[model samples]
Target chain A: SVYDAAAQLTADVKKDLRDSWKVIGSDKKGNGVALMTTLFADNQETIGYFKRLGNVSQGMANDKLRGHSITLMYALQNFIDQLDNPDDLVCVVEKFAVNHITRKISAAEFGKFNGPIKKVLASKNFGDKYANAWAKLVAVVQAAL
Target chain B: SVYDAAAQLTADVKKDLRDSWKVIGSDKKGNGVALMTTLFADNQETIGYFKRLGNVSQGMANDKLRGHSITLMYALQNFIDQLDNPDDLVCVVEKFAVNHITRKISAAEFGKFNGPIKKVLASKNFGDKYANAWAKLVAVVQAAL
Candidate 1:
């Protein structure tokens, strides 16, 4: 029940997630802005849904934009941090669902980020193999949500 | 560890949270709009942070505004829905920390909303009693964040 009906992250996939997360999450104030900017660039409507998040959609990234990106990436780190703990991870997913469900974010919307994440990782030299693990993790979280 | 160093939400407070939520969350279209509009009015800077949320800041409310409010109320529902589950509630808090962390949203920033919520509830006849619950809950959430 901890995993619900979701597929477990294979040990192999787990390694990929951890390794890539180290690279992406290492910056503390870094990588998230890159992903956030990418998502906004690719999806303009994302701005409207994120009105409470801070000012990233202004003409360019300002302090608020920086704040929002850092916040989002930090949140993403919470998910990746619990990769091996299925129980806590499930709790994490449910908590996210609270926001997403209220926001009316669809599984389809989550998929929108899925591609952006892959693209961002690609820019970071994650390549495809590392990215597939992220895809699986996103799918699981979206499913749980 | 469930509540960490934050104050625990009292049972009376939980009741207050639930009772007021019933009134606010019942609309589905939502009291969040009322609160959101109030926020935007009180703080124009709030609009910049939320550019991706939709066109709510576009002179007045629109479909995007509707989407955002509905989404906001829905997510609020998620938090209240688990009021009895402190374990889940803490998870809720931690999950929120992720987004707030990246953005640098301070406890003071949360206090901004707490007052708005109280004012909004005041309009709903929650008077002071029901409003305290929200203030306390918001404090807890912010503290956890």
Candidate 2:
């Protein structure tokens, strides 16, 4: 069963997600870019939505990709920032889902991001301890979609 | 010359962006949706980036587009929120431009948004009273890009 959208995160998981996200989201030297690059390689069509991708087929020291990836991280940062405020968390997560849907990004596509998320987390040495915690967050987003 | 990134808003323009934004950004009955729709019509290339936009040509009551438009609104709200904090405004505006740049949205294209923004502002009946305020905000963003 999918995790409940209303499911409460114990302090442990919240802290885990918060810690993991901050590390993963760092702009200058973090796995934020890696997550999206994994998504591009793991799911090809999604790559087309990114504009001006010239020569990026080689993968890039691409500032274009870096900025795009970081914006996404900031978004998740906002979500983590709201963990202590459950009502607002629900509001933002749901609204975030709606925004993705506007991009023509399906719920299934959004769900697919979990793979990239975990890949980056593992690359950062967090292991699977944080996986379930992220699942609950993912469930909230997916359920909204 | 563009407005100074460090230019102080004389309280007047900041309040204009803040108040005008609140009205124009309303999801249910406001001009938020109207702004992007105007952009889609005003500029052609931006349309291709939005996914699953079937038959939106008829000008949709499109929830897909609706969610998308509101997200843009919330972003501006953040900028307005930081206006009172000049250092932070400069920091955030610069980063915001970077995020747009990654999408392959050019400074010119980002500048194009002002047309839609003003259209919505006008429709909301605020007229051009807020124009100078918005110009300063736009100048900061463009300078960063």
Candidate 3:
């Protein structure tokens, strides 16, 4: 069913993803900090993982937050491009799994990212069209995790 | 000296990259084809290497051209974000070198891309301000090749 959802991602859904990507990528640093802030807010315990965000009331001005954010955006964009390639998709998810496993991050903790990402997407008013697309993607990712 | 040039890439250069990224990513299909077309025009010999572009007369509608272009733009954006990370930069270049080598593509052929890319930048009206930054990047890539 998850694979079907992923496969059924319509051309319209892909367009929505591309359309909203600009907003996400526009202010790389600011968005990165915002996402990190939201991540911590949604899951306070996750803050312990980011040494750099510790003691910072606001990630908006954090250079490391910005750098990490841009890096993550790059990775996300590449994955979007590779959605059609099953091997590439699996490799990307495996890398994420490997990194989190090494850090002893629980699968549930990693899964919590959906909330912040969804909030970000909603803020852009990406609508149900994109949300459904993202849901399918998250479904695929959660299964992999 | 090449390293110095790359290192000298200032805030202005970063700003330019951030500024022009949209144009490059905007008309994804069109820009990709144009770049490939230019590459072929500038290096007739390369026209022989891309069998997919064979007899197409123009790369404008070539699916493979669009895919390669998007992948390249992703790589460029990633490199721009990691400008300060020497290890990352070298790793990206090394990956490119490895892929091309496997294809039996000469380093010299890879090095010849500066002209077409420069033309693309100039068409974007990037102006002389960013020329120095690109020169340094090209120099670094050339040396790596």
lDDT scores of the candidates, listed in order:
0.68, 0.66, 0.62
Query: Which candidate, 1 or 2, would have the higher TM-score against the true structure?
Result: 2
Model 1 lDDT per residue over B50-119, tens place? 7755566552245456545554564566567557666545555665566677777777777788767878
Residue B42 lDDT in model 2?
A: 91
Off by over 4 Å in 3: A1-7, A10-145, B1-5
- What docking grade applies to model 3? incorrect
Q: How many residue pairs clash in each candidate?
A: 18, 0, 0
Candidate 2: residue A124 lDDT (0-100): 75
DockQ of candidate 3 compared with the true complex: 0.10
* Model 2 chain B poorest 10 in a row by lDDT: B24-33
Task: State every prediction's TM-score relative to the real structure.
Answer: 0.49, 0.54, 0.52
Q: In angstroms, how far off is A115's CA in candidate 2?
A: 1.2
Q: Is the docking of candidate 2 incorrect, acceptable, medium or high quality?
A: incorrect
Candidate 2 accuracy as TM-score: 0.54
Error of 1 at A45 (Å): 2.5
The collision pairs in model 2 are none
Q: Rank the candidates by lDDT, best first.
A: 1, 2, 3
Model 1: C-alpha RMSD to truth?
Answer: 14.3
User: What DockQ values do the models have?
Assistant: 0.03, 0.09, 0.10
Please give the ranking of all candidate structures by DockQ, highest first, separated by commas: 3, 2, 1
